[PDB]
């Protein structure tokens, strides 16, 4: 249930998404991350942005303390937020994440986004987001030093487009390739071409919003189609006697995509590990590939006007 990364470490192919909006109490992240670990998740996805690293790290330490897992059985990810791109800010941000979780290292540290912000959402007096210009090759060199230090076992990026990934791959004296690019990916935005490019470079694509996103009104149009109501996914859930969420997760695994799944619901957290219990046929995969429609749920002025907006290409 693992994939081997390009630096030789292993990443579990199903991960637990931990983000929940500020209206959910912080204590819920502790409880649901324990439940996820109990259910069998071994890859846990967090970030500075999520304001939950203390609770998530406590859930992991608690499951280590009670004998359920060892540290080495857990793959924990955190992410550099975009106000900390300046290379001198990278290691201190990572050390702050580690102190919050009370862990000695993360399994994976990512650049959360290429869209640099003034050193969470800095805004000018009108309401406009304040951007920054940073050479992300320098950010990347700071990430590589964090791996050399043992602060992160592996390092990768998120929300990069092909051009952005090439800039890092082509960097003079690159030491470590990104292990992964974590991006929005689901059957209405399946990233087929980006996935090919990643496979060609032995980089793993990690899908977020694989179940169609939380549809948070801050970034998602509530008029957008609801992925888990899709009629093809419904028809395939009835064929397999599973659920449309499980169809959408299994689709990713069969394409060689590592897939995240957030749920703060006890039943759905346990449901999602059923993804390993069945498989889809080629005609089933073809039907899901046919749903692709260039639909990114995160679709906001706060991204689309950024000079480094990943969806410009
Ligand atoms: N790198 C980035 O910029 C980025 C961006 C977005 C997401 N992420 C990561 O990816 C994680 C997952 O993405 P996401 O937060 O967009 O959510 P998601 O995984 O697409 O889930 C969307 C909704 O699906 C529901 N759900 C889960 N299992 C289900 C099931 N079996 N049946 C029916 N509904 C189900 C959940 O509601 P309930 O909680 O009510 O079950 C969740 O709110 C995030 O938590 C975060 O870790 C990263
Ligand atoms: O990481 C998340 O779960 C997450 C949750 C809320 C907002 C968000 O913002 C960005 C989304 C896409 C690109 C850059 C930033 C990310």
From Swiss-Prot:
Per the UniProt record, which EC number(s) apply here? 1.1.1.-, 1.1.1.210, 1.1.1.53, 1.1.1.62
Entry's SUPFAM superfamilies? Answer: NAD(P)-linked oxidoreductase
Q: Where does substrate bind?
A: 112
Binding-site positions, NADP(+): 18-19, 45, 158-159, 182, 208-214, 262-264, 268-272
Annotated active site residues, numbered on this chain, are 50 (proton donor)
Q: What is the effect of changing residue 167 to I?
A: No effect on 17beta-HSD activity
Modulation of this protein's activity:
Strongly inhibited by nonsteroidal anti-inflammatory drugs (NSAID) including flufenamic acid and indomethacin. Also inhibited by the flavinoid, rutin, and by selective serotonin inhibitors (SSRIs). The oxidation reaction is inhibited by low micromolar concentrations of NADPH.
Site (Important for substrate specificity) location in chain: 49
Q: Which GO terms describe its molecular function?
A: 15-hydroxyprostaglandin-D dehydrogenase (NADP+) activity; 5-alpha-androstane-3-beta,17-beta-diol dehydrogenase (NADP+) activity; aldo-keto reductase (NADPH) activity; aldose reductase (NADPH) activity; all-trans-retinol dehydrogenase (NAD+) activity; all-trans-retinol dehydrogenase (NADP+) activity; androstan-3-alpha,17-beta-diol dehydrogenase (NAD+) activity; androsterone dehydrogenase [NAD(P)+] activity
Q: What is this protein called?
A: Aldo-keto reductase family 1 member C3
Source organism of this protein record: Homo sapiens
The primary gene name is: AKR1C3
């Amino acid at each position: 249930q693992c994939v081997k990364l390009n630096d030789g470490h292993f990443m579990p192919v199903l991960g637990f998404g931990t983000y929940a909006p500020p209206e959910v109490p912080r204590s819920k992240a502790l409880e649901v991350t324990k439940l996820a670990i109990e259910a069998g998740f071994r890859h846990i996805d967090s970030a500075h942005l999520y304001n939950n690293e203390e609770q998530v790290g406590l859930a992991i330490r608690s499951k280590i303390a009670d004998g359920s897992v060892k540290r080495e059985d857990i793959f924990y990810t955190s992410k550099l937020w975009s106000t900390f791109h300046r290379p001198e800010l990278v290691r201190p941000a990572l050390e702050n994440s580690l102190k919050k979780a009370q862990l000695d290292y993360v399994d994976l540290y990512l650049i959360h986004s290429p869209m640099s912000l003034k050193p969470l959402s800095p805004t000018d007096e009108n309401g406009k987001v304040i951007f920054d210009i940073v050479d992300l090759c320098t950010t990347w060199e700071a990430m590589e030093k964090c791996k050399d230090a043992g602060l992160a076992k592996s390092i990768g990026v998120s929300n990069f487009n092909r051009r952005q990934l090439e800039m890092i791959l082509n960097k003079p004296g690159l030491k470590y390739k990104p292990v992964c690019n974590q991006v929005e990916c689901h059957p209405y935005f399946n990233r087929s071409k980006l996935l090919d490019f990643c496979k060609s470079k032995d980089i793993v694509l990690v899908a977020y919003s694989a179940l169609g996103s939380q549809r948070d009104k801050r970034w998602v149009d509530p008029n957008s189609p609801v992925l888990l109501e899709d009629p093809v996914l419904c028809a395939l859930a009835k064929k397999h006697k599973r659920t449309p969420a499980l169809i959408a997760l299994r689709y990713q695994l069969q394409r060689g995509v590592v897939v995240l799944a957030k749920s703060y619901n006890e039943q759905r957290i346990r449901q999602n590990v059923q993804v390993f219990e069945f498989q889809l046929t080629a005609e089933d995969m073809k039907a899901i590939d046919g749903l692709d429609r260039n639909l990114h749920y995160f679709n906001s002025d706060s991204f689309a006007s950024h000079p480094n907006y990943p969806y410009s290409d």
